[PDB]
Amino acid sequence: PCYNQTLSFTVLTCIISLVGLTGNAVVLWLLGYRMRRNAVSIYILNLAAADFLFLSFQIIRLPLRLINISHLIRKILVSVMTFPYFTGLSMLSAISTERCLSVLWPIWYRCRRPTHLSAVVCVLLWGLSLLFSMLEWRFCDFLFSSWCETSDFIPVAWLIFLCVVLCVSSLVLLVRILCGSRKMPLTRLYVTILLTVLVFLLCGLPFGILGALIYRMHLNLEVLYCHVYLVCMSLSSLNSSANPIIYFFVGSFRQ
Ligand SMILES: C[C@H](CCC(=O)O)[C@H]1CC[C@H]2[C@@H]3CC[C@@H]4C[C@H](OP(=O)(O)O)CC[C@]4(C)[C@H]3C[C@H](O)[C@]12C
């Protein structure tokens, strides 16, 4: 904490996290058994599970900032929490590109899909989220040699690839929709895509870019960067909290 203005910030973070696990738990309970796992609901299911892990780790992390400062276990929690965050961003990107592919070629999607590619790509995303967690961890990495000592920007490359592929998938979906017959439910489609892109860039992505440029330039959080880290953490928490809403509750409450 800089001097003050931290207790209310972590209280807001904790409340947002509480509603986050509430929503993630209800959506996980509904989709786990009261669902059919058609083609994308698997993505929503495991994304909601990873998000539940996220907000749970948030409620584990924040209340220890005010009492019993330790400065080491904190690094451990942010290090481990990097993995569920990467998983959640990967699942958001996968959902976006998967919807884009479904719209681009619907016949292939509905007929010629292997009907198990969802699980395969899900486990590949989880495995690659196990990887790329060694951005800041330049600690005893060389256990043997050709390894980027300090300027290791491969996880940054993965994150920027995820962001750009999500953006290009949304753009291609919009171009395909706007270059065809206008059935004109073209207000629900506008709002959902705009909301997903906005909640990915304005929220969530700030946490990733914060980690990226905080381990690229080794900043000790000084007293100048103890006010923006809280904002980034709460933005990521709110993104993870509202993530189940947009993808499941909007559809469920539509009828
Ligand atoms: C998501 C990114 C990595 C993603 C990436 O770039 O590929 C994660 C990785 C390690 C995380 C930082 C480690 C400790 C940083 C310093 C402080 O640590 P505390 O004692 O807990 O207050 C605050 C947390 C802190 C600002 C974390 C911010 C950010 O979330 C990081 C860098």
From Swiss-Prot:
It comes from the Eukaryota. Residues 61-75, 138-152, 215-229 are extracellular. GO terms for cellular component: plasma membrane. One of its GO terms (molecular function) is G protein-coupled receptor activity. It is found in: Cell membrane. Its main location: membrane. Glycans are attached at N4, N68. Keywords: Cell membrane, G-protein coupled receptor, Glycoprotein, Membrane, Receptor, Transducer, Transmembrane, Transmembrane helix. It is a multi-pass membrane protein. Belongs to the G-protein coupled receptor 1 family. Mas subfamily. This is Mas-related G-protein coupled receptor member X4. The chain holds residues 22 to 280 of 322 of the full protein.
